[PDB]
């Protein structure tokens, strides 16, 4: 009767437990940013009781392996989350239909977006790239990161305009899509190639840092599939920026005006569009701030198991 159903569920739990444990040290198959929240609190046929992964919308998940059509094995990208069971999109959509059927009975779109397995770090500010103050100030930060995270870091130049890398544009198989692109910046093929280059650089869970020439503002990457960590190098006083640009001679100074415009553009950007804001006066202090953030990220994406 019920005692043999319990024997079947007990052994099966043990198989799942074993799969789960074996998957602990496995590489990440892919990453997702979630579009929906999921709570495991109230359900059965979860492969191992208490082991389902609950998550909020906009959380990042690392998927390691397929358990079955309903469940994958992976983890919430968060310092102490261990492996667990994540509901597949099919399950989540079935849960949505069941919720809709319940709703009718009262008689009163993609849950997961694929993302790089490590969020690429992007630097914006204090002003426009291709000018000396911003370029020199970012170079300093890039040199530090190469040192502080040597062995765990990949810093790469991206000249291609990855701002054109809107997710829908890149999924579009149609050979007619090109006739919609008024003057293109760079080529969408090259952009796609470059996006896959970034996904690939992060596949082994090393920190990825992009030196992205075309990105001066977070809104240029928000529609993309990169889910970057956007680090805002902020000079708080415009008077300071003006003087810094003037320190670089008459040529640089001739474009004081555009430079101050971009700076002010970033300055009115909502704080929520950035992941980190480095407004420290001293390189050493900004560097430490950035390292603390990236070290915690490292811990979110690795800690004890591997």
């Amino acid at each position: 009767l019920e005692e043999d159903r319990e024997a079947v569920r007990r052994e099966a739990e043990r198989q799942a437990q074993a799969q789960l444990e074996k998957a602990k040290t496995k590489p990440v198959a892919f990453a997702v940013r979630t579009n929906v929240s999921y709570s495991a609190a109230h359900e059965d046929d979860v492969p191992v009781p208490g082991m389902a992964i609950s998550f909020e919308a906009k959380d990042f998940l690392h998927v390691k392996e397929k358990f079955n059509n309903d469940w994958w094995i992976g983890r919430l990208v968060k310092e102490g989350c261990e492996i667990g069971f994540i509901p597949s999109r099919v399950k989540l959509e079935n849960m949505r239909l069941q919720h809709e059927q319940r709703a009718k009975e009262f008689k009163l779109t993609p849950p997961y977006d694929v993302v790089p397995s490590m969020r690429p770090v992007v630097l914006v500010g204090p002003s426009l790239k291709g000018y000396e103050v911003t370029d020199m100030m970012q170079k300093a930060l890039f040199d530090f990161l190469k040192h502080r995270f040597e062995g765990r870091i990949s810093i790469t130049r991206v000249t291609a305009d990855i701002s054109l890398a809107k997710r829908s544009v890149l999924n579009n198989p149609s050979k007619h899509a090109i006739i919609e692109r008024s003057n293109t910046r760079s080529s969408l093929a090259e952009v796609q190639s470059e996006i896959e280059r970034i996904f690939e650089l992060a596949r082994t869970l090393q920190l990825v840092v992009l030196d992205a020439d075309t990105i001066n503002h977070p809104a240029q990457l928000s529609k993309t599939s990169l889910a970057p960590i956007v680090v805002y190098v902020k000079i708080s006083s415009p008077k300071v920026l003006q003087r810094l640009i003037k320190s670089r001679g008459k040529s640089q100074a001739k474009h004081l005006n555009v430079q101050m415009v971009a700076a002010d553009k970033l300055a009115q950007c909502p704080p929520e569009l950035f992941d980190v804001i480095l407004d420290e006066n001293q390189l050493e202090d900004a560097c430490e701030h950035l390292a603390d953030y990236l070290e915690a990220y490292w811990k979110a994406t690795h800690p004890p198991s591997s």
Binding site: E132, V133, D135, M136, M137, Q138, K139, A140, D143, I235, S236, S237, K239, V240, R243, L244, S247, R248, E280, N281, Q282, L283, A286
Partner: peptide, 17 residues
């Protein structure tokens, strides 16, 4: 505080040469 900002930011720039 402007002199502080400037001096720190100036040496930061020099580190980016």
């Amino acid at each position: 505080q402007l002199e502080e900002d400037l001096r720190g930011y100036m040496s930061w720039i020099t580190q980016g040469e």
